[PDB]
Ligand binder design. Structure first.
Ligand code: HEM
Ligand SMILES: CCOC(=O)c1cc2cc(-c3ccncc3)ccc2n1CCC1CCNCC1
Ligand SMILES: CCOC(=O)c1cc2cc(-c3ccncc3)ccc2n1CCC1CCNCC1
Ligand SMILES: [Cl-]
Length: 411
């Protein structure tokens, strides 16, 4: 029996996510077709012209694909499952220059070098300054009495995390943040005028200039670790550092932001959990917020050979799209997946991807950012209450909130 879905339904359709998360549709696939061919009409495949893709809705299947990276490739078609329908193939293939869209051994080399900037010591070194700025952001917002939670609470701390990691001077953080915000969302009418191509080029240019500068005058910031050769002589070229910075500007910006915004949305929806959070401040809340928020709705892979997955024959060359938003609510893995529970432990969500070679290198930096900001929100506006409904982002792979009006004072 075929799943009860509208004819021609596309789970990557940005017009859906601009309005809602298709929670009932995902649940229908998990019940009636956990692996399901999502057909795509000509010129409607978001930049891919192969007829469609396999929708992956179960967490165990998401994990299996992510582990078998020898079969399921990031490089072949990139991992983003939706661009503008008119994008040129060359604009998809330029993304193979960032680590996210590489396969081994190229990915293995880069990941080893970049891992020197995400050690627990390097990330933990950002704790104090990020805590300081989290407290300042919440106090500034609470003083305004009411406003846009997305812009006054959620936006700044993730960007300051990227800036602190890279050792960007305060005078430059303004344009760095601008370039980051110009990277994503070009399919929402509100951001129709942004040029991610142009920003990418400016970001790389800024980063290359920074790499050259930082070789002359090293410090402890991870940038020196990245461009300093090891015993094997392995290090990031200047253009490699540039493509890494472009990746950070995207990877750690709107992801953590939307986790913050949708975490607070859940707290407003579940006051018992908010009261529990304010009293205990449990750091397990961060993982439940990421599971609930699932900022990356979906990433794709391409099969390099025929592969049988959960009784379904995946053919060489076909795309599989891992819907993290479906897997993070998989009934077989979670007890009461649709209960927001900040104490859930263990919490094997795939908000940071499935375990494997590409697992989010910034997961713990993200968890620290989330924990610090919600401690500050609890410290400074414990009775904030929504004013109106959130405005969702028109995107086929990013689950974003553009605006959300809140009374930080309550009355
Ligand atoms: C709530 C926040 C975040 C979420 C939901 C998230 C999600 C993800 C996902 C789904 C992937 C792909 C994993 C896979 O394909 O198996 C990924 C990879 C990555 N993330 Fe994050 N991320 C977050 C925060 C961050 C931050 C703060 C940083 C850095 C400052 C970061 C840096 C990266 C990088 C560099 C990769 C590429 C790793 C690779 O391809 O080997 N992420 N992330
Ligand atoms: C400085 C290094 O980066 C670039 O030049 C650059 C960044 C970029 C981003 C997108 C894009 C794609 C999708 N959604 C947002 C942005 C597209 C093209 C991009 N290009 C150049 C493209 C050509 C590829 C090879 N032939 C000459 C140039
Ligand atoms: C060529 C320079 O690099 C890029 O253009 C680039 C880097 C990058 C990193 C992530 C990511 C996200 C989350 N966790 C890790 C990495 C996602 C997308 C990325 N893009 C493409 C931007 C496009 C903007 C328009 N809509 C389609 C996507
Ligand atoms: Cl986007």
């Amino acid at each position: 029996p075929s799943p009860n879905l509208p004819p021609g339904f596309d789970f990557t359709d940005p017009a859906i996510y601009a309005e809602r998360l298709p929670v009932a549709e995902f649940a229908e696939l998990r019940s009636a077709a956990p692996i399901w061919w999502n057909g795509q009409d000509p010129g409607k495949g978001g930049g891919f012209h192969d007829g469609g893709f396999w929708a992956i809705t179960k967490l165990n299947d998401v994990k299996e694909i992510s582990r078998h990276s020898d079969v399921f490739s990031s490089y072949e078609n990139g991992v983003i499952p939706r661009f503008k329908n008119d994008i040129a193939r060359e604009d998809i293939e330029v993304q193979r220059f960032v680590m996210l869209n590489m396969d081994a051994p190229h990915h293995t080399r880069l990941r080893k070098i970049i891992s020197r900037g995400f050690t627990p010591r390097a990330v933990g070194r950002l704790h104090d300054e990020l805590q300081e700025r989290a407290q300042k952001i919440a106090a500034e917002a609470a003083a305004a009495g009411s406003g846009d939670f997305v812009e006054q609470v959620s936006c700044e701390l993730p960007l300051q995390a990227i800036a602190g990691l890279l050792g960007v001077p305060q005078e430059d953080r303004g344009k760095l943040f601008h370039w980051s915000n110009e990277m994503t969302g070009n399919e929402d009418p509100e951001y129709a005028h942004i040029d991610p191509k142009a920003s990418s080029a400016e970001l790389i240019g800024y980063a290359m200039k920074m790499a050259e500068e930082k070789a002359k005058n090293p410090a402890d910031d991870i940038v020196t670790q990245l461009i300093q050769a090891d015993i094997d002589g392995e290090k990031l070229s200047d253009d490699e550092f540039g493509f890494f910075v472009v990746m950070l500007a995207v990877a750690g910006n709107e992801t953590t932001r939307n986790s913050i915004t949708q975490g607070m949305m859940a707290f407003a929806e579940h006051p018992d959990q908010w009261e529990l959070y304010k009293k205990v401040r449990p750091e397990t809340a961060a993982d439940e917020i990421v599971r609930w928020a699932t900022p990356v709705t979906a990433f794709q892979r391409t099969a390099l050979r025929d592969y049988e997955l959960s009784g379904v024959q995946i053919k060489k060359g076909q795309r599989v799209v891992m819907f993290y938003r479906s897997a993070n609510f998989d009934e077989e893995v979670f007890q009461d997946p649709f209960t927001f529970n900040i104490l859930r432990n263990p919490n094997p969500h795939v908000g940071f991807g499935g375990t494997g070679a590409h697992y989010c290198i910034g997961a713990n930096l993200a968890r620290m950012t989330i924990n610090l900001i919600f401690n500050a929100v609890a410290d400074h506006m414990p009775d904030l209450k929504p004013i109106s409904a959130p405005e969702r982002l028109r995107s086929g792979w990013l689950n974003g909130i553009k605006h959300w009006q809140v009374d930080y004072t309550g009355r």
